[PDB]
Design a protein around this ligand. Sequence first.
Ligand SMILES: COc1ccc(O)c(-c2nc3cc(C(N)=[NH2+])ccc3[nH]2)c1
Ligand SMILES: [Ca+2]
Length: 223
Amino acid sequence: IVGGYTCGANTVPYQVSLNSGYHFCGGSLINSQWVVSAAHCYKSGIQVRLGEDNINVVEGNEQFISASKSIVHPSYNSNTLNNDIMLIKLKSAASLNSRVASISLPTSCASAGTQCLISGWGNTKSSGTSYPDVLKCLKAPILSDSSCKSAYPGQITSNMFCAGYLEGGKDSCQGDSGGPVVCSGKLQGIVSWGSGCAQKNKPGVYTKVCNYVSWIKQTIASN
Ligand SMILES: COc1ccc(O)c(-c2nc3cc(C(N)=[NH2+])ccc3[nH]2)c1
Ligand SMILES: [Ca+2]
């Protein structure tokens, strides 16, 4: 997260760290046994880490659960990143409390101008790598589709939305992928891609979760 602030331990209780021996992606807890992340975060050997704050120290509140299966969206395209969403089922259910809680799925999509909270342990520099130990937060607004499409002409599908600052300086970055974009208490986006990080006129692009709620519910209902 570039230009963000320290969230504070356990203030984002649905945030998970996808770990394969190091933090590689973010994710969101949607019920005690399922996590939602981005399809480009897929790999086998995924341990889901809940209740985290400093990902390098065990401080208490952490629950490490192995993924029983990951379900990448069948229409995911790794060249365009269209349908960049993945569901991970956990081997065992997490104990939900105040530090580990699920986030609700939206009933409607969000509008441009909606302010959302993006969080993650991804890079904090737009030039070079500085990964933090604790979770960073950034409040960013969803942008209008016309500004999004003028920024990435021909690269935005109806399953993507832009959120961020066109003047540059604040954005999500590498390491943040798969994590949550929460607006008004509802999961509206999944960190997906961007051109560099916090560069002017290059806002972050996110998976538009409101287009997948029936797919998520139908898939969880059958697995
Ligand atoms: C270069 O290697 C990788 C590998 C996986 C990623 O998700 C990313 C990545 N770049 C990203 C850029 C952004 C952004 N909003 N500017 C957000 C997530 C990203 N994730 C980069
Ligand atoms: Ca920790």
